[PDB]
Design a protein around this ligand. Sequence first.
Ligand code: NA
Ligand code: NA
Ligand code: NA
Lengths: 126, 125
Amino acid sequence: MSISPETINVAGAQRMLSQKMAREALQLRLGAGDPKALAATIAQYERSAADLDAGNAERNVSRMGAPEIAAQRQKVAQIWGRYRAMLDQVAQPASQVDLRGFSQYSTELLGELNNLVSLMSARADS
Amino acid sequence: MSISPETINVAGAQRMLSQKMAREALQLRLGAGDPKALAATIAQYERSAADLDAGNAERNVSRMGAPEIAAQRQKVAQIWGRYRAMLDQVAQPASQVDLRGFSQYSTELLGELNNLVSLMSARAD
Ligand code: NA
Ligand code: NA
Ligand code: NA
């Protein structure tokens, strides 16, 4: 591997975080949740996204400048912005939302994050 | 690396699957879910757990026999068995369930899956 294992770990964990935040938001919709937990999960995702975009030497996350990888990070980022806004709405018990649309979007983001991991691994691995 | 990168990918994805299942079960609790999706996610976790325990040549998942890794897979399996049962309760809109208990247990399983990934990576480089 040309990148650190931690780089691939952080990218893979984005997949998990996307799902964790959805569960936390749905639990908030049910009135049994914790806004602090949701915020913290979203913050972990965003911290990792910035680390993957810029590199983070302290955290041992490599910036991968390959154009296809950078393009996939940007594709992910556009989906993420819309998903993040949906999370905020889902988490409010009294809001109007489309829960099937939310689920579809969670699955879409997950797929694009998995695609990011795949591209990173292809470039990194022998 | 002594193990295939796919081995680490599959172990990491178990973290994700544990959380996807919770998302799906809560969607079902809210009447906006899909039982087939939850079933598929559970099945994927179970196949991957089997692959990590035994190896799977077709899928390029390597065996890792180090005692600490085997012990952690066993620890995960005990938590998983209990978690899996909780899912069915959560997913029923009309059940009485303790959702905070469920989320705590989801986070516990996630942590042990993360610990498994860490142990695997340490051994693999
Ligand atoms: Na919550
Ligand atoms: Na083994
Ligand atoms: Na097992």
